[PDB]
Design goal:
- This is part of a larger assembly, with two copies of chain A, one copy of chain B, one copy of chain C and one copy of chain D.
- Chain B is an all-alpha fold.
- Chain B has one helix at about 1-45.
- Chain B is rod-shaped and about 70 Å long.
- Chain C is an all-alpha fold.
- Chain D is an all-alpha fold.
- In chain D, about 95% of the residues lie in helices and about 0% in strands.
- Chain D starts with a helix and ends with a helix.
- Classes of the chains: A mainly alpha, B mainly alpha, C mainly alpha, D mainly alpha.
- Chains in contact: A-B, A-C, A-D, A-E, B-D, C-D, C-E.
- Strand 2 (about 55-60) of chain A pairs antiparallel with strand 1 of chain E, so a sheet runs across the interface.
- Chain E: Belongs to the V-ATPase 116 kDa subunit family.
Chain lengths: ~190, ~45, ~425, ~55, ~110
């Protein structure tokens, strides 16, 4: 009985400690992710001891580079360093991969269309036309104004519950369906019109 | 840029080399000077 | 220096027509003509005029500029004099000549101290550079800082400019010994941790290099012993990323390392852990890393002395127990068990009473950790602790607040517990 | 140019100030202190030996 | 329309600059230094130490999850994990002692 009481007390103390240990590990997960990102940057990008700085080059959006580099330099200066980071541009004959900016609703359609590939930094983007073309064609194959209402209603609940849906996980097929709620709603509206 | 940054590094390396030589120079100079001073001090004992 | 150059710009930009003031009798007419020649010594060197070759002509002009008290008039000449000592082409020799001639040195002394803050900084810079007992006397607790620093900022506006004057004195050992008699040492330790400057390393590096020279002087070593937060000032310098700034803090610490003070730093500030943290910190200089290894070696010798005190139960006697590395370490703990049991655990029994009631929960926790070491080596030692009521206190102490007290008490409760039931 | 040349000159100034004012100054002052101490450390022993010889005489 | 950007982040704030850049994120990392392997490389040894710390933190998190917990920093996490492991070992030893004593009590009562 004494040994069981001691074991119970030790287990209770361990659980009480783990209650805060898990809370600390919650933020430690993001800390470890940031450390891993910095480690990948260090192992991938070299540095100059003569410059006593980490230097390199990489692709960046011109619009983003208009403010991101300045913000990084300002943060480096605010980090009590003797001098902030650089913001110089670089040029090369190679064509870096690039992605067009994705909106909150256009993201799903853009991802669906991009499953065939990508293009140059500012080349043709068939996603712009197909964002409405696919609803403009998939409606005909299912044109019946008694079921399109049902499809829209089913999509509508997903859009409404999006606040809770974004947090709670679901089935893999269910998650894939919820990923394109706006596209599903647009297709349902087109089908209702058809 | 890179060449401009390299000049500061070369100057720093030259200053480092000068500082490194300064140690031996000062050590030898002080040794000789204090040998003369110690000889004078020992001569004072004779007086 | 850029900081010297920015102050030198403010003066040489603004122009001063001496000959008008000379007619008013503010300045000598010959001196007014000399002041223009001294500034244009470089132009004379370009013309290859014989005037440029002669140091005395510039030195006489420098003496007239030094005599002027108004900051603007003096600066338009003092900045030229500072440029002259810096530039070989214009009045390179005059600076050495001014010190050599008694009258020119006296004129710099008149310019020194009481002067416009920009001029006082400029005057207290040429006088400081060799190219002096009087300069050492001019140094005082207020110093040129009463004008070079943020108070009366004018153009110099910087404690570091005043610190640069102090750094110049550090070079003469007797002057540093004289500066040790002067106060402001406590202010200097906080000031050495300057955090705001165009270059972070520049703000503290000038103070750091001087501190290494200060360590060498024995009277200044006595002043250093009085100074507190020395580990904190070194820790802030270690926190500064520049390897050289940290290395100067480390070089000063190594040169003035007192085994007792270093042991105190190891016991309270974890100086040995800081040496490991020095390896953790990136260091460009090989010497800085070599010094950190040297610091651990010296810390290890201090730890051996601490181990003898732990066996002696010196802390037990004072009732002023503290964590220290050897007591926690198992090999030292195994020898300590017998030492703690001096006679029927008599030394341990005093510790058990201290564990039951301690001035701090952490102090009781330190006693509980030591009790866990002794209990592991000998079961009978725990029985004596139960008689002292230390064992009864441990169970309540696990419930008691404080992370150190709760963790140590939980270990003590489990340590007894493992043995009661097999 | 512009920000790039400003960063270049800032890097040059920072490097020269860190290597010269912070590090090279440390080596120079350490060398000076060693010069002060080391040979006097033997001058003391030489003086003691001279005193012993004078006592014998 | 992206483009190349070349910059230098001083070692005095290289970690801070990397953290600030990762707060928002604009430019993908390069791959020039990747040919040197996790063996030293530019800072892969430091990356190796960070990876070891992350592995220790992951082991601690897995232990906490096994315990039903709810979710210098690396050193603190390792110390907490060691304390939890010691507490679990003490509890297991006490439970084993209780089981042995209960078995002995049952045998003695039957005898």
């Amino acid at each position: 009985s004494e040994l069981k009481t001691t074991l119970d007390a030790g287990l209770l103390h361990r659980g009480n400690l783990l209650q805060t240990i898990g809370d600390q590990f919650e933020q430690w997960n993001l800390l470890v992710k940031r450390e891993k990102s910095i480690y990948h940057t260090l192992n991938m990008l070299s540095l100059d001891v003569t410059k006593k700085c980490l230097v390199g080059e990489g692709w960046s959006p011109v619009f983003a580079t208009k403010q991101i580099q300045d913000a990084l330099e300002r943060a480096a200066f605010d980090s009590n360093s003797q001098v902030g980071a650089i913001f110089q541009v670089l040029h090369t004959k190679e064509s870096p991969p690039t992605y067009f900016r994705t909106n909150k609703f256009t993201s799903a359609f853009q991802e669906i269309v991009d499953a065939y590939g990508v293009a140059k930094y500012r080349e043709a983007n068939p996603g712009v036309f197909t964002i409405v073309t696919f609803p403009f064609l998939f409606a005909v194959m299912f044109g019946d104004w008694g079921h399109g209402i049902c499809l829209l209603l089913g999509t509508l609940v997903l859009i409404v519950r999006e606040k809770k849906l974004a947090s709670q996980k679901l089935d893999d097929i269910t998650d894939m369906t919820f990923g394109g709620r706006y596209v599903i709603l647009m297709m349902a509206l087109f089908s209702i019109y058809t | 840029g890179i060449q401009q940054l390299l000049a500061a590094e070369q100057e720093a390396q030259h200053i480092v080399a000068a500082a490194r030589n300064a140690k031996m120079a000062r050590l030898r100079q002080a040794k000789e000077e204090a040998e003369r001073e110690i000889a004078e001090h020992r001569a004072q004992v004779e007086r | 220096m850029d900081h010297a150059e920015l102050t030198t710009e403010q003066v040489l930009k603004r122009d001063i027509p001496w000959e008008t003031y000379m007619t008013t009798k503010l300045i000598s007419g010959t001196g007014l003509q000399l002041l223009r020649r001294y500034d244009n010594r470089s132009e004379s060197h370009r013309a290859q005029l014989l005037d440029d070759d002669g140091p005395s002509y510039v030195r006489v002009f420098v003496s007239i500029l030094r005599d002027i008290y108004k900051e603007e008039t003096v600066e338009y000449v003092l900045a030229l004099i500072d440029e002259m000592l810096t530039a070989n082409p214009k009045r390179a020799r005059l600076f050495h000549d001014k010190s050599l001639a008694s009258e020119d040195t006296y004129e710099p002394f008149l310019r020194l101290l009481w002067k416009g803050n920009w001029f006082i900084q400029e005057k207290s810079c040429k006088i400081l550079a060799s190219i002096t007992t009087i300069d050492d006397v001019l140094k005082l607790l207020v110093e040129w800082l009463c004008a070079q620093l943020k108070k009366p900022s004018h153009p110099s506006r910087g404690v570091p400019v005043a610190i640069n004057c102090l750094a110049a004195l550090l070079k003469e050992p007797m002057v540093r010994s004289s500066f040790v008699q002067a106060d402001g040492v406590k202010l200097l330790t906080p000031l050495i941790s300057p955090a705001s400057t165009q270059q972070s390393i520049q703000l503290l590096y000038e103070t750091c290099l001087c501190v290494w020279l200060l360590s060498y002087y024995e009277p200044a070593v006595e002043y250093l012993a009085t100074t507190r937060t020395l580990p904190r000032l070194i820790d802030v310098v270690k926190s500064s990323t520049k390897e050289k700034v940290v290395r100067v803090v480390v070089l000063i610490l190594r040169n003035l390392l007192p085994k007792g003070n270093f042991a105190a730093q190891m016991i309270d500030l974890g100086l040995p852990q800081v040496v490991q943290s020095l390896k953790a910190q990136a260091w460009s200089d090989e010497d800085l890393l070599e010094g950190l290894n040297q610091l651990e070696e010296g810390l290890k010798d201090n730890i051996k002395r601490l181990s003898s005190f732990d066996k002696y139960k010196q802390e037990v006697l004072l009732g002023h127990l503290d964590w220290s590395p050897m007591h926690k370490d198992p090999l030292f703990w195994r020898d300590n068990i017998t030492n703690f049991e001096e006679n029927d655990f008599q030394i341990l029994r005093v510790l058990l009473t201290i564990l039951d009631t301690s001035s701090d929960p952490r102090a009781l926790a330190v006693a509980c950790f030591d009790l866990s070491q002794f209990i592991q080596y000998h079961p009978a030692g725990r029985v004596i602790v139960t008689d002292l009521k230390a064992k009864e206190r441990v169970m309540k102490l696990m419930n008691h607040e404080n992370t150190e007290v709760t963790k140590s008490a939980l270990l003590c409760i489990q340590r007894l517990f493992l043995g009661a039931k097999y | 140019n512009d920000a790039d040349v400003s960063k270049q000159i800032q890097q040059m100034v920072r490097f020269i100030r860190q290597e010269a004012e912070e590090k090279a100054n440390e080596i120079s002052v350490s060398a000076e202190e060693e010069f002060n101490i080391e040979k006097l450390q033997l001058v003391e022993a030489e003086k003691k030996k001279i005193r012993q010889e004078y006592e014998r005489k | 329309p992206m483009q190349l950007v070349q910059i230098i982040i001083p070692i005095e704030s290289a970690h801070l600059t990397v953290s600030y850049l990762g707060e928002l994120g604009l430019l993908q990392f390069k791959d020039l230094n990747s040919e040197k392997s996790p063996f030293q490389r530019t800072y892969a040894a430091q990356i190796k130490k960070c990876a070891e710390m992350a592995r220790k933190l992951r082991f601690f998190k897995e232990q906490m999850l096994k315990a039903g917990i709810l979710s210098d920093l690396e050193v603190k996490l390792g110390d907490l994990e060691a304390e939890l492991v010691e507490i679990n070992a003490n509890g297991d030893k006490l439970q084993r002692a209780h089981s042995e004593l209960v078995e002995y009590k049952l045998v003695l009562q039957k005898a």
